[PDB]
Design a protein around this ligand. Sequence first.
Ligand SMILES: *CCC(=O)NC[C@H]1CC[C@H]2C=C[C@@H](C(=O)NCc3ccccc3)N2C(=O)[C@H]1NC(=O)[C@H](C)NC
Ligand SMILES: [Zn+2]
Length: 98
Amino acid sequence: SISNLSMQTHAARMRTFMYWPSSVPVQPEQLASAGFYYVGRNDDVKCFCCDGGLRCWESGDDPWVEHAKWFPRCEFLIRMKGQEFVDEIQGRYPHLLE
Ligand SMILES: *CCC(=O)NC[C@H]1CC[C@H]2C=C[C@@H](C(=O)NCc3ccccc3)N2C(=O)[C@H]1NC(=O)[C@H](C)NC
Ligand SMILES: [Zn+2]
C-alpha cells in the first residue's frame, strides 16, 4: 500500500515545491512526476509510495532513474516505468544496495 496518501496526486506533490531551492538544477515537474514531494529541508524529497528519500540532486539527474537506482521495488515506479526499465538500471548499477 501507499505510504503517504496525501501526496498521491501530482498537483499535491507539486504544491510542496513552493520554496524549492534555486541552486538545485532539477525541476519540480520532473520530480513530482517521478512520485516525489518536497519535505522543506535543503533538497530533500520523498516518494509518496515507497517513502524512499533522495537528496543531493546533481545536474543531469533524471528523477525516475534515481528512483530505480535506490528504490527499485517501489510499486509506483514499476507501474509507471515498468519492470524492464528498472531491471536495466539495476543491471547497470549491480553493486549499489549490495
Ligand atoms: C547534498 C549535499 C550534502 O548534504 N551532502 C552529504 C551529506 C548528506 C546529508 C547529511 C545528513 C545526514 C547524513 C546522511 O545522509 N545520512 C544517511 C545515512 C548515511 C550512512 C548510513 C546510513 C544513513 N548526511 C551525510 O552523509 C552528509 N555527508 C557529508 O557531509 C559528507 C561526510 N561530507 C561531504
Ligand atoms: Zn517510490
